[PDB]
Design a protein around this ligand. Structure first.
Ligand SMILES: CC(=O)SCCNC(=O)CCNC(=O)[C@H](O)C(C)(C)COP(=O)(O)OP(=O)(O)OC[C@H]1O[C@@H](n2cnc3c(N)ncnc32)[C@H](O)[C@@H]1OP(=O)(O)O
Ligand SMILES: [Cl-]
Ligand code: NA
Ligand code: NA
Ligand code: NA
Length: 172
């Protein structure tokens, strides 16, 4: 009943879209957001690009099969958390927290000033969860140009501006 966190490798990339698809099944019982469950997921090219940079981790079960991942990208002096997904059958076992812990340890080791993300404000496993870990909700102005651009494009593909926010965890 134990899991391990490790760096992702190139051979793992092909397995990751199915994990992101499985993770999104949690949105089918939110009526306003149920469409998310059949939204796109990142392709293998995206994962391979970040695995080459080294900023990509996964959780594996006792048989070594990947069951969740965290894909991140260094952007200037910040580590941006692009996607964090745990497969449905392995949610609520602590793995999301453990992958975030790994990402922040890597951000500190690589001399990043802060971590960033964008997410839903009022989904219980999104912004409220991240806030308990120290991520701060940003105003539009505090978001800065890079995160503002993401939020703007999100509004073109289905997200409602009033339901999304950028967040930052500053490493003191
Ligand atoms: C920047 C981004 O990537 S935002 C996108 C996030 N990804 C998604 O929303 C996809 C669907 N969700 C998931 O994949 C997972 O639920 C994750 C990654 C959000 C969380 O990973 P998990 O392994 O389930 O999280 P973990 O078991 O560590 O739980 C962490 C906290 O989330 C809470 N939580 C997790 N799932 C739920 C749920 N369905 N309902 C309410 N609370 C939940 C837990 O209660 C826990 O809080 P606690 O410390 O008060 O107990
Ligand atoms: Cl809803
Ligand atoms: Na689908
Ligand atoms: Na995604
Ligand atoms: Na730095």
């Amino acid at each position: 009943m134990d899991y391990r966190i490790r760096t992702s490798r190139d051979e793992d990339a092909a397995l990751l879209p199915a994990i992101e698809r499985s993770a999104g099944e949690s949105f089918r019982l939110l009526p306003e957001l149920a469409w998310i469950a059949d939204a796109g997921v990142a392709g293998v090219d995206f994962h391979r690009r970040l695995i080459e940079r080294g900023s990509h981790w996964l959780a594996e079960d006792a048989d070594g099969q990947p069951v969740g991942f965290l894909a991140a990208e260094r952007c200037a002096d910040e580590l941006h958390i692009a996607e964090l997904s745990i497969a449905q059958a392995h949610q609520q076992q602590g793995l999301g927290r453990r992958l975030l812990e790994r990402a922040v340890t890597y951000a500190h080791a690589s001399h990043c000033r802060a971590l960033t993300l964008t997410t839903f404000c009022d989904v219980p496993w999104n912004a409220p969860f991240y806030a308990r870990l120290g991520f701060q909700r940003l105003t539009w102005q505090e978001a800065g140009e890079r995160l503002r651009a993401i939020l703007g494009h999100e509004q073109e593909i289905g997200f409602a501006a009033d339901s999304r926010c950028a967040m930052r965890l500053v490493l003191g």
